[PDB]
Design a protein around this ligand. Structure first.
Ligand SMILES: Nc1nc2c(ncn2[C@@H]2O[C@H](COP(=O)(O)OP(=O)(O)NP(=O)(O)O)[C@@H](O)[C@H]2O)c(=O)[nH]1
Ligand SMILES: Nc1nc2c(ncn2[C@@H]2O[C@H](COP(=O)(O)OP(=O)(O)NP(=O)(O)O)[C@@H](O)[C@H]2O)c(=O)[nH]1
Ligand SMILES: [Mg+2]
Ligand SMILES: [Mg+2]
Lengths: 165, 103, 106, 167
């Protein structure tokens, strides 16, 4: 079995932990406990292949430990809350830091817009997410909800597919 | 006295979990962290669980030591190392099974 | 594994004595060794007042220590762990109260 | 303040601990318990200069001690100790003498030959003429007979080693 090391990054309260836990355990985390650093191991079939995912659930609220995430991780999910405008703005500097630390403009990645089930609460429209995805060397993009299990599997699937090239 | 992060491993405690991390000061205790980790894996109950200094290599812990309630685990981590060749981790285990595996 | 020897340092108990050393097996307990150490230092259960300590520091006086529990097997404690780089490590025989203090504030 | 590494070698029961405890703590030991390996530190003056001595009180039990190899390598001065009460202790010394001379690989090692328990004149098996001749044989070696009980030559054993090490 081939291991893929994946990293979930983004500002506090966006749903990195909820996305990870939904993917790995199949339950929805309601409580808000800010993560320090959780790690998960899940086996998936991704295109006729048995893959072993190590997924790093990182801290929103720890710049010291951040450099090690980026040096060792092969795939990165950058996650924002469609509810929270600021969370989107903070992603720009995350992209640039991954690229700075790895020294390549060609890193497997996916821009994740979380909380799409909170439709009556949008502050970041799908257009905004695509426009940045475009600017980011035409990077991959999804809107997701960890509550209703929408594109949750996609996030980590797409990442594996990308490393596979 | 620097505040580092401790990776607490769940030796069969929350499905596909590997470790949950916990911030620890030089004044932090085992029991304070067993409390912080238990509500982190989502599991007083505190009394029946134990923070453990596990050693193995290349998994299966070849030997472990259960930490005393008063002990400061940041110092246990930072001031000692495993045998060269051997790996080391902190482990949250039920007290019964932890004491059982010391002998 | 091997039926090794452990230097038990008598950091001030009898003037002159640097260390006196006991035989320890893989099954030898800390309390067993406290009992043989006190006998060898010249000191019914005065054992419970004394502590076997895993001490550490730069090379000397100890910068941090740990009081072994009575159940703990001391040969294993020294065989399976090591001090961090640049640090010396020895077993010490101390008064339990002295030891529990230093274990908390150093 | 120079550090002096001194090793008290010999067969069991000859009075190794006794000589050392006397020299160091000023008291004479009662009962007899097998030493694994003990170490003492005492500051004393020799010739206008105050010195630090680490004394190693070693094991009689030769079969239970392979640590012999380390302390011969490490030690700067040796006191080979026999009781004048038992002939074996004296005979079991030429072995030890050569073992030191082999490891350091020279006959010019600071050394003192020591015949302990000289207060027990009545149970003497090894003569003084025997002890002194063995010293002449041992590359004209320093020799004394000492009593840990009576304080005979006790400090003179250790001062002599220091004096021999001064080079
Ligand atoms: N309705 C809804 N709520 C969500 C969704 N995803 C996460 N949440 C909620 O948002 C809150 C924060 O979620 P969490 O996963 O902890 O976000 P986080 O990015 O891991 N926070 P941190 O980085 O500080 O550890 C929780 O109450 C969680 O239930 C979603 O898709 N829909
Ligand atoms: N009369 C007399 N008795 C002595 C003298 N030196 C030692 N003894 C006695 O002989 C016994 C053995 O002496 P000890 O110092 O234990 O000898 P050891 O060489 O250290 N034994 P081991 O090597 O097994 O630890 C003790 O009980 C002690 O009192 C001495 O000079 N005179
Ligand atoms: Mg989180
Ligand atoms: Mg002795």
């Amino acid at each position: 079995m081939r291991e893929y090391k994946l990293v979930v990054l983004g500002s506090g309260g966006v749903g990195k932990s909820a996305l990870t836990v939904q993917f790995v355990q199949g339950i929805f985390v309601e409580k808000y406990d800010p993560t320090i650093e959780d790690s998960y191991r899940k086996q998936v079939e991704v295109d006729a292949q048995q893959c072993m995912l190590e997924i790093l659930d990182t801290a929103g609220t720890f710049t010291a430990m951040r450099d090690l995430y980026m040096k060792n991780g092969q795939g990165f999910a950058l996650v924002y809350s469609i509810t929270a405008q600021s969370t989107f703005n903070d992603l720009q500097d995350l992209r640039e830091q991954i690229l700075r630390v790895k020294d390549t403009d060609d890193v497997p990645m996916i821009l994740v817009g979380n909380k799409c089930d909170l439709e009556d609460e949008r502050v970041v429209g799908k257009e905004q997410g695509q426009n940045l995805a475009r600017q980011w060397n035409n990077c991959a993009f999804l809107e997701s909800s960890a509550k209703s299990k929408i594109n949750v599997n996609e996030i980590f699937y797409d990442l594996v597919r990308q490393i596979n090239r | 006295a620097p505040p580092g992060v401790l990776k607490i491993f769940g030796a069969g405690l929350a499905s596909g979990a590997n470790y949950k991390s916990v911030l620890a000061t030089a004044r932090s205790t085992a029991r304070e962290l067993v409390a912080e980790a238990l509500e982190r894996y989502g599991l007083s109950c505190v009394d029946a669980f134990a923070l453990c200094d596990a050693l193995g290599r290349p998994w299966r812990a070849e030997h472990l030591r259960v930490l005393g309630d008063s002990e400061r685990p940041l110092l246990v981590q930072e001031l000692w190392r495993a045998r060269p060749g051997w790996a080391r981790r902190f482990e949250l285990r039920g007290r019964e099974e932890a004491r059982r595996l010391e002998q």
